[PDB]
């Protein structure tokens, strides 16, 4: 199968050996066993050139998985912030939801990554958004005593 | 009216299965080769079988690095495979390990009692009753106590609990005379107490449960002389258990 | 990447002939084996000496017509090993094919496959040519199908059936036959195509203007559409490149894998446009297996255009087709028409009434309108099994009589799959 | 599936034998030393069917049959060896065959079998010639089936079997030969063509214009059926090749095997015919009863399976028209619930002094009406117990005649139903 | 034993009809008798047992559906875990349906609580 190929190359992160595969025309949006396509993984471990070389072939920018967790999500959780910007520019779901009722601000707030927070608010970020628990990205900053994460999110 | 043994069924091989990259592989310093290497021969070679073969099989070159593991070997990984590997042998092969089988493998396993992670006691204690149900009590039973007595804690709850898994699966039927009576009080009593005289409260229980197990193998009228030595408070916790055990 | 192909019972052998005559003519590849001239290695392997031999298995229970192999034209080509024969055929009869004297060869098969998987670097799986009324065919190709699901489960596996058809028929119980294999060869098919013999020989009779075609008649018919479908894996195109493709792209349903193939144009030998040859493939009269698609849904649909083609063309043909016709589709399909191209001409063999066009087209699409095949096959099964009539010779072979209840079953709940689809 | 042993027994057995080994020597181009000159290839392609010479057993307790064969044109052919002969004759007494004198010889016989057999690539099966009103073609001969049957299980079973009439011969002890003979044949064999003197004597009385048949007369139909019935076994083609394939798609109950075979044109001993029949011609001697071997009216029945055979040159195209067309103008005659069950096969080489010919394999529920008059004859017969004395002095019970009359009762019972089943 | 030791190998033989028969005398040899007085039949089940994989694989429908029988005797007497560690898994799954179709048919204790059938010396005891 080329789309588990490809798969295999976008999350270990040969930036080379993708270009091999998709000119091959292997599937951008092959799916593995949990749903996850290869945009979603380059997303995850930070390969910025195969994000970019995905979605200029037609990778699915809002794709969800099984839990659905769209690339903004992976991305902001890990932070990779220069990928967060990339997927944005070409139409990424600012306020995605996933299973858990997580928004990728509150995985970037979760984890720290401040400025990943003040990107995803300036894309109009719900800042109100709540999850399952019914917790905001504003409660888990006064949860978590970040008042620098506090600041940003009010701003 | 008998019943049948289902073990007539017909044996299998498995001597003819291993690869010729595999004891440089167990003897290797990188801890997946020696992994996988076991792995293999558990997942493809072992596991599928049902009865190894009795007839003119020499396992005690493969059981003797299994071994070396199971002691030794650094990654619990490793152990753990390993020891599963122990029981399948033990297990499909019932009737083999009469001694030299049986104890090239015992005093390792309990020395590696030690590990305390979940699934590495799990898989070192199913072995040590394989190698006990086909082979009890011909070495173990003193080797266990030896090592009741030995220093590490874990290495004396789970030795201790060893010989009460045992005590409940004991058999008949020879004379009185059978090898526990032989050393019940010189040693199976002496060492028992050891544990039920410990610093720590979680072996002072073991102990409790393999005295009460004890007394209800061989009567709690013969050892009630210890119990008199015994405090009083010690005394209550062991009855507790004598009320629940069943051998 | 290299496939290996398996061809069972006259059927499967004698197209399969007509399959490496068309490989070796469509590669420059010589009758002794040699080429003085990568993609086509997926179905060849090579000698040291220089000679390219196919990754084939030829079976048959019985040696008349695989001793015509190694004793023609294309003798040298195969490995003698490659060619098994048994003595006692079928004899028309599933259960001989499978249980009683298809267990007497089955192991040294798979013993001569191993050999070819074993040449092999990174196998994808199985070509399976057989007919569905033969004996051998159906009884030892499901018996096949079976051990290959388990010696080399993790891969693909893809039928060319010949479904029957009463102007060359053998035999009466071929549709026990059909059924029988369809039913326990199910679970073990990724994808299959049916050949209806009725419709290559009205193709035969109409566009090749034959009277009473013979078998080579049909089998240049049908190798034709074979290569037709096997091009994307011997010449490395875009589309359907290899085996898992197959699937992805015709296969939305386990169980309902089987695509009809339409193929124009079959022109007499005694140039046509880019468009004229798409409507054709919307054309009942020129479909492998004889039904109305106009009755039936859509699953997929891809289009394999091979020769002087530009791709413009085939856009505007696609939406003439798109808009002038109304194919229904599936509301949970894609409803994109697949494309891909391969510049190289189909060839044909020197001699054949079937004449070199400038342009080809092989439209292989999963409509439910093939459902109406398996109901033909269905009814006359019913009329037979309703008076238990040539039951005997199975049973007396080695085969319960259950399993024939268990097929119809699993073909009446086949026949149920493909209406919830399309409804 | 190649090669088929021949057997022969008793003097019907010999006679109709060797007359049919006369004919398809012919065709095949083999003279009576037994060496090649022919001129074409379609005749040598499956020459190891029949032949090495013959693969021909020849068996009788009658010891004068020996030369009775030898002293004929095709004698020489034979090899020596499978000459089984006995000392005395059965005397028209079944019992005798089956398990007196004829079951002292069968072990004999079945050692040439069995050594024409070892030396055989891949047998088929088996294929024997006889009368059913004899004593020993119908007592020794089926005692011979069996004993066949279970040493070779594997294999075939193909007889020829010659129904008696009382037409020519008048010994009334025939009908109780005949029925004992058929209680064997419809558990012993995978396919028997029932071969009627009472039609025999028939057509050459009423279509051939004899006013007296002799024997030759009647083995000459018989023979040219013989030879039509197995071109599809001696000659290339796809259609109902082998003898198990046959038996498969003409045989859907296996008690009910037995085929009624019909052929055309009728011709006389070496006469002179017209220009060559035309194909609709052909397909038109069918459904007409004059040309069946067994009389029986297939009008009277339904049809479970059909083999036709056209040999000669002719337009495929046609006789696919002809026999699809009588077919459906026809189609309250042939049976509704086994679909495609009329096939056509065509063989380019002519038979011996025709330009064209036709072979109608059938199998017709009317051939009830054959064991009616056996039956009726039998019961006639047992009812008054007559000539009882002569079976049972052999070993037999009363009882056999008894089970093989009820025995063929429920045979032609289960003709009747298969006639009046319905599809709906 | 001695009496089904010396016609086991007659399951072995060419003609079906001896085997379908043979398999049906074996079959009834057990439900009227069974195995008492027995000194290995550890031994005796293993060697009637070989072979009853190809009697059910069998080509004859006789010899297949005399062999279900057989199997049902041997169940009848000590099944059905123990032939379904031995036998069940082998067989055909259609076969193995009516085999346990027929244990439920079946009523009476895990083994026969009377023979219908003594021997010798059991029959003055
Ligand atoms: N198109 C095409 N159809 C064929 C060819 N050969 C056979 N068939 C069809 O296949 C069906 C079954 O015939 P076979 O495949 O020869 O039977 P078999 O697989 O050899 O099995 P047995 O002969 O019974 O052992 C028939 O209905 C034929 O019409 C062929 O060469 N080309
Ligand atoms: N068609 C035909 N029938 C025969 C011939 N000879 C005998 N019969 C018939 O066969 C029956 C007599 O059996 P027959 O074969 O002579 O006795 P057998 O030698 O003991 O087998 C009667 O019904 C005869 O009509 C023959 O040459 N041709
Ligand atoms: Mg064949
Ligand atoms: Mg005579």
């Not at chain 2, 007839?55 to 005690?60: C, G, H, I, T, V």
């Not at chain 3, 035969?204 to 078998?215: A, F, G, V, W």
């Not at chain 4, 060797?18 to 030393?33: C, L, M, Q, Y």
Request: charged share 20%.
């Amino acid at each position: 199968d080329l789309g588990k190929k490809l798969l295999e190359a976008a999350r270990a992160g040969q930036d080379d050996e993708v270009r091999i595969l998709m000119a091959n025309g292997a599937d951008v949006n092959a799916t593995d066993a949990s749903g996850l396509t290869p945009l979603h993984l380059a997303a995850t471990y930070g390969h910025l050139e195969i994000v970019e070389v995905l979605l200029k072939h037609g990778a699915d920018v809002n794709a969800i998985d099984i839990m659905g967790s769209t690339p903004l999500h992976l991305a902001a959780l890990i932070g990779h912030l220069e990928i967060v910007e990339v997927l944005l520019k070409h139409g990424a779901d600012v306020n995605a939801v996933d299973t858990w009722g997580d928004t990728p601000l509150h995985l970037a707030a979760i984890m720290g990554h401040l400025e990943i927070v003040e990107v995803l608010l300036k894309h109009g970020a719900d800042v109100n958004a709540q999850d399952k628990f019914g917790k905001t990205a504003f409660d888990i900053s006064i949860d978590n005593g970040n008042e620098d994460l506090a600041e940003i999110l009010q701003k | 009216n008998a019943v049948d043994p289902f073990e007539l069924l017909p044996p299998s091989v498995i001597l003819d299965k291993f690869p010729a990259d595999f004891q440089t592989r167990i003897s290797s310093t990188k801890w997946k080769d020696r992994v996988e290497a076991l792995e293999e021969i558990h997942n493809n070679v072992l596991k599928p079988v049902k009865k190894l073969a009795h007839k003119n099989q020499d396992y005690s070159d493969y059981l003797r690095v299994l071994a070396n593991v199971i002691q030794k070997d650094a990654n619990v990984q490793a152990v753990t495979i390993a020891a599963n590997s122990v029981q399948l042998l033990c297990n499909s092969l019932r009737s083999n390990f009469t001694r030299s089988y049986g104890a090239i493998v015992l005093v390792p396993l309990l020395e590696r009692t030690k590990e305390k992670k979940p699934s590495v006691n799990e898989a070192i204690c199913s072995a040590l009753d394989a190698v006990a149900t086909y082979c009890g009590f011909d070495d173990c039973l003193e080797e266990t106590l030896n090592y009741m007595k030995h220093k590490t804690p874990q290495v004396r709850i789970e030795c201790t609990k060893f010989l009460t898994r045992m005590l409940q699966g004991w058999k008949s039927d020879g004379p009185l005379q059978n090898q526990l009576l032989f050393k019940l009080l010189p040693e199976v009593t002496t060492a028992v107490l050891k544990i039920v005289n410990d610093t720590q409260p979680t072996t002072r229980n073991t102990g409790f449960e393999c005295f009460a197990t004890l007394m209800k193998l061989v009567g709690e009228r013969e050892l009630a002389d210890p119990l008199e030595k015994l405090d009083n408070l010690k005394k209550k916790k062991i009855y507790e258990y004598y009320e629940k055990v069943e051998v | 990447r290299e496939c290996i192909s398996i061809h069972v019972g006259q059927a499967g052998v004698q197209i399969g002939n007509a399959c490496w005559e068309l490989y070796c003519l469509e590669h420059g590849i010589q009758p002794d084996g040699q080429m003085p001239s990568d993609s086509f290695n997926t179905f060849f392997s090579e000698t040291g000496a220089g000679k390219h031999v196919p990754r084939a298995v030829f079976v048959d229970l019985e040696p008349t017509v695989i001793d015509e192999v190694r004793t023609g034209t294309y003798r040298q080509l195969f490995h003698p090993e490659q060619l098994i024969t048994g003595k006692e055929d079928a004899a028309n009869n599933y259960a001989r094919g499978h249980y009683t004297i298809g267990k007497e060869i089955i192991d040294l098969v798979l013993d001569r496959i191993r050999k070819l998987a074993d040449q092999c670097t990174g196998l994808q799986g199985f070509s399976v040519f057989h007919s569905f009324g033969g004996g051998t065919g159906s009884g030892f190709t499901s018996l096949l199908m079976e051990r290959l699901s388990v010696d080399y489960g993790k891969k693909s596996k893809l039928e060319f059936s010949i479904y029957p058809a009463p102007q060359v028929s053998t035999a009466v119980v071929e549709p026990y036959n059909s059924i029988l294999t369809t039913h326990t060869t199910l679970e073990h098919s990724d994808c299959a195509f049916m050949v209806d013999n009725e419709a290559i020989y009205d193709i035969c009779r109409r566009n090749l203007d034959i009277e009473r075609p013979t078998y080579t008649n049909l089998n240049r018919l049908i190798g034709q559409i074979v290569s037709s479908i096997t091009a994307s894996l011997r010449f490395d195109g875009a589309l359907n490149v290899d085996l898992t493709e197959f699937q992805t792209n015709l296969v939305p349903y386990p169980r309902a894998h089987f695509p009809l193939a339409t193929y124009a144009p079959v022109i007499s030998a005694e140039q046509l446009s880019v468009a004229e040859i798409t409507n054709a493939c919307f054309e009942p009269a020129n479909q492998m297996v004889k039904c109305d698609p106009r009755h039936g849904k859509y699953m997929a649909c891809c289009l394999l255009y091979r020769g002087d083609v530009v791709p413009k063309d085939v856009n505007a043909a696609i939406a003439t087709i798109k808009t002038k016709r109304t194919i229904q589709f599936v509301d949970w399909c894609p409803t994109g028409f697949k494309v891909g191209i391969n510049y190289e001409p189909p060839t044909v063999v020197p001699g054949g009434d079937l004449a070199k066009v400038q342009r080809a087209v092989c439209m292989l699409s999963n409509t439910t309108a093939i459902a109406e095949a398996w109901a033909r096959l269905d009814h006359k099964f019913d009329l037979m099994y309703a008076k238990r009539a040539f039951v005997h010779w199975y049973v007396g072979e080695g085969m319960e009589e259950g399993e024939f209840s268990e097929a119809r079953e699993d073909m009446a709940a086949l026949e149920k799959d493909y209406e919830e689809v399309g409804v | 599936m190649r090669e088929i042993v021949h057997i022969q027994a008793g003097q019907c057995g010999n006679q109709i034998g060797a007359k049919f080994w006369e004919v398809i020597s012919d065709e095949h181009g083999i003279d009576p030393t037994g060496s090649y000159h022919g001129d074409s290839d379609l005749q040598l392609e499956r020459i190891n069917v029949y032949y090495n010479v013959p693969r021909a057993i020849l068996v009788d307790l009658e010891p004068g049959t020996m030369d009775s064969v030898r002293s004929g044109p095709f004698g020489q052919i034979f090899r020596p060896d499978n000459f089984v002969f006995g000392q005395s004759g059965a005397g028209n007494n079944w019992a005798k065959g089956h398990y007196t004198e004829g079951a002292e010889l069968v072990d004999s016989v079945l050692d040439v079998v069995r050594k024409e057999s070892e030396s055989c690539d891949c047998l088929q099966g088996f294929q024997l010639t006889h009368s059913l009103g004899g004593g020993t073609g119908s007592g020794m001969g089926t005692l011979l089936i069996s004993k066949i049957r279970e040493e070779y299980p594997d294999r075939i079973m193909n007889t020829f079997s010659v129904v008696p009439s009382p037409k020519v011969s008048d010994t009334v002890v025939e009908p109780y030969n005949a029925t004992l003979s058929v209680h064997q044949l419809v558990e012993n064999t995978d396919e028997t063509y029932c071969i009627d003197n009472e039609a025999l004597y028939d057509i050459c009385f009423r279509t051939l214009k004899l006013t007296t048949p002799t024997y030759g007369d009647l083995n000459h139909l018989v023979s040219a059926t013989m030879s039509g019935v197995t071109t599809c076994l001696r000659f290339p083609g796809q259609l109902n090749a082998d003898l198990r394939k046959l038996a498969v798609n003409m045989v859907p109950f296996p008690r009910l095997h037995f085929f009624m075979p019909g052929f055309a044109p009728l011709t006389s001993r070496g006469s002179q015919q017209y220009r060559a029949l035309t194909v609709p011609e052909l397909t038109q001697q069918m459904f007409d009863a004059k040309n069946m071997m067994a009389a029986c009216d297939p009008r009277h029945g339904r049809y479970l399976t059909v083999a036709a055979v056209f040999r000669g040159r002719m337009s495929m195209k046609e006789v696919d028209e002809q026999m699809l067309n009588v077919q459906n103008k026809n189609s309250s005659y042939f049976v509704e619930w086994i679909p495609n069950n009329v096939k056509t096969a065509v063989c380019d080489i002519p038979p011996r002094g025709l330009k064209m010919s036709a072979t109608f394999i059938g199998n017709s529920t009317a051939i009830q009406e054959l064991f009616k008059r056996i039956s009726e004859q039998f019961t006639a017969m047992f009812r008054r117990k007559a000539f009882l004395h002569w079976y049972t002095g052999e070993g037999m019970d009363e009882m056999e005649f008894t089970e093989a009359e009820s025995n063929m009762n429920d045979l032609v019972s289960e003709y009747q139903q298969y006639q009046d089943a319905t599809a709906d | 034993q001695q009496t089904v030791n010396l016609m086991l190998p007659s399951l072995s033989n060419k003609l079906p009809r001896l085997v379908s028969s043979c398999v049906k005398c074996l079959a009834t040899i057990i439900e009227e008798f069974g195995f008492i007085n027995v000194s290995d039949i550890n031994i005796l089940l293993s060697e009637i047992l070989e072979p009853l994989p190809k009697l059910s694989s069998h080509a004859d429908r006789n010899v297949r559906s005399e062999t279900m029988n057989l199997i049902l005797q041997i169940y009848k007497w000590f099944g059905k875990e123990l032939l379904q560690e031995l036998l069940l898994e082998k067989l055909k799954p259609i076969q193995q349906r009516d085999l346990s179709r027929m244990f439920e048919k079946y009523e009476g204790t895990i083994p026969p609580k009377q023979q219908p059938r003594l021997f010798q010396w059991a029959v003055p005891a």
